[PDB]
Symmetry: C2
Subunit: 380 residues, 2 copies
């Protein structure tokens, strides 16, 4: 595809391939990698990342809810897909026909799915167990047994796996982590027979403790080259390559005189003879209003966003009079300088996870693999 | 169309018809309404709002950049569309074939476009004037006259319009509004002749000074029923009807015992026996992490979000054991209680404009017209 505005994101699939193949090296031959590709693969592109990760050593994929999995299937992915979240009992027949595995955590769910679905496809279920996260999961013994029993009893229901999720695996202090690991090991005994896929680890516990991950790792944020926390960074076994960058170009350049105002509410006043540039990105692109005092890169230099950020545009104070068409990097490298996603997150007072997720549908993704432009994805 | 997670946004298109029709009543009949549906009609659905607005009295449409205008053509809109922002000179040809008017503000763009285009279709240009916003637009007489000449010389370039935009039209104090209006009046005398469409007003300027709008208004945020700012809410001529609401359903319910922790970084700890509900909506849905100390409505009552927000789900403290499948309203009414976009905006410390825009592609839109469902639009749909 192609696009008709000079704002785009670039996704480096070679960086995603290396982050996966290095864990494939660091893990046991027995142990599968489930690449987590929810939320349009954290804002990087679901198909493009799912494909790259399966080439690199992942055998399975994971999504957040059923529409994200049906979308991967429609685009030609035929690899296994687990929905990590919840679904409707009434949609278990769709999941089955499309070979999507479902998370289960409540007995009344199954009771209901059983009435509604008679066959002929099998449906593979993963039992989530709540250890100390408080989000989804079974917590008591007789609720586990009732699920196992409702699955055992139905001809087309299969328990392929079971799992938990750690609240504090990114935290230096492993004390809630070892409470959750112990609680899990104990809950695994409520089950007759240990199922074929037992998994517990997100990117953090799988790069910190790769042996105490059983036979499947779910690998998320670190695939994208982003650390789980600041605290976990000098504890990780290999370097992560960063996959996402964001670029734009100057579309107007003007010399402002003193006392001249810029943007909504006229909250910026020019004090000297300043060159101001307009770039075609704003908050509907996910470049949120709170980035008003932040530095982008223009011609190797940091340059401040001056005045309020608009829906589709914002302004920067230029080093001097640059030509229209000059590339501005908002996330990425411009020679000598770098802005990382971690930098953007610092200013928005979030975690890195939130940032590529918020760069919207409006922003094209240009994909690079084997150091060459592979593909353009423009959503509108 | 269909969706398979119990999180959806509803857009009431009757509200959008009323907000636009009320403006057609308010404005002089010789003054046209340009409805601006940029950013997927401010997160509400571009072609659905565009079709409704053109029914209530709008005649033109405005968008931010060319892909948004071309996407409206593909979905069957034949009305005039103006691209308010910048475009590539190379694309002048496509814009002209698809009858999209363009904003122009620099002569080097036109120098470059004369060279790449030579009919047969006309390209309608709207010259942008910077009178005090500092974004796009001419600021000089030599450059205004150069653009006009380069337009006059090519047989296929047409100046259909002329505009400016206000930085503080939504402030109670009109002092900067007045400098900018007076500066537009002076800047208009730099042109040999007046083109057919002179426009300046946004929602705030047109709701406040209907008589000072010349012959076209560019109506945005007030179409969706959101006030331009809270300062001018008492100054507004007719009531505005909010079109957007956001909803979810409980997918998990459980009681905690005293001392158990909830979510990432295990921030929250229950202190009595409490019922915790999980909803399938998180920050990749635009329900951003900073809303962690906010609340949602469950069964007519306010209930807090408990712990950190996750990518695709968050937890809330419930009043007691509620059923799984209970509707939760994040933005909208439940009984006597209401949560508005201005509430969310205040907690997020932003303007209301930024909130529907950030509710992402992931969240389905269900459209209502004549109090019944008209269509579902799931962007990651089949």
């Amino acid at each position: 595809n192609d696009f008709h505005r000079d704002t785009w994101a670039e996704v480096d699939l070679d960086a995603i391939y290396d982050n996966v193949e290095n864990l494939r090296r660091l893990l046991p031959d027995d142990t599968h990698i489930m690449a987590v590709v929810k939320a349009n693969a954290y804002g990087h592109g679901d198909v493009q990342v799912a494909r790259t990760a399966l080439e690199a050593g992942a055998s399975r994929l994971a999504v957040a809810f059923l529409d994200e999995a049906l979308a991967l299937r429609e685009k030609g992915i035929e690899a296994p897909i687990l929905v990590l979240g919840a679904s409707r009992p009434a949609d278990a027949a769709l999941a089955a026909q499309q070979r999507i595995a479902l998370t289960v955590f409540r007995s009344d769910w199954l009771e209901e799915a059983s009435a509604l679905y008679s066959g002929p496809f099998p449906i593979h279920f993963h039992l989530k167990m709540d250890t100390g996260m408080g989000r989804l999961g079974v917590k008591d013994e007789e609720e586990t047994k009732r699920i196992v029993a409702l699955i055992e009893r139905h001809p087309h229901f299969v328990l392929e796996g079971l799992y938990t999720h750690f609240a504090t695996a990114d935290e230096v202090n492993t004390d809630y982590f070892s409470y959750q690991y112990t609680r899990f090991l104990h809950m695994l005994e409520w089950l007759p027979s240990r199922p074929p896929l037992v998994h517990c680890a997100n990117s953090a516990a799988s790069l910190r403790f790769p042996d105490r991950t059983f036979n499947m790792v779910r690998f998320g944020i670190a695939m994208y080259g982003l650390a789980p926390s600041p605290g976990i960074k000098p504890l990780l076994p290999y370097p992560l390559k960063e996959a996402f960058s964001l670029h734009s170009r100057l579309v107007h350049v003007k010399k402002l005189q003193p006392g001249e105002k810029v943007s909504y509410g006229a909250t910026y006043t020019a004090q000297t003879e300043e060159w101001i540039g307009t770039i075609p990105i704003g908050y509907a692109d996910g470049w949120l209003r709170r980035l008003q005092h932040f530095h982008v890169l223009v011609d190797g230099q940091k340059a401040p966003i001056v005045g309020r950020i608009c829906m589709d545009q914002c302004m920067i104070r230029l080093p001097g009079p640059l030509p229209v068409g000059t590339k501005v990097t908002l996330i990425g490298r411009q020679g000598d300088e770098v802005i990382s996603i971690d930098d953007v997150a610092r200013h928005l007072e979030t975690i890195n996870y939130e940032v590529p997720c918020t760069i919207s549908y409006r922003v094209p993704r240009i994909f690079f693999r084997h150091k060459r432009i592979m593909e353009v994805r423009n959503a509108i």
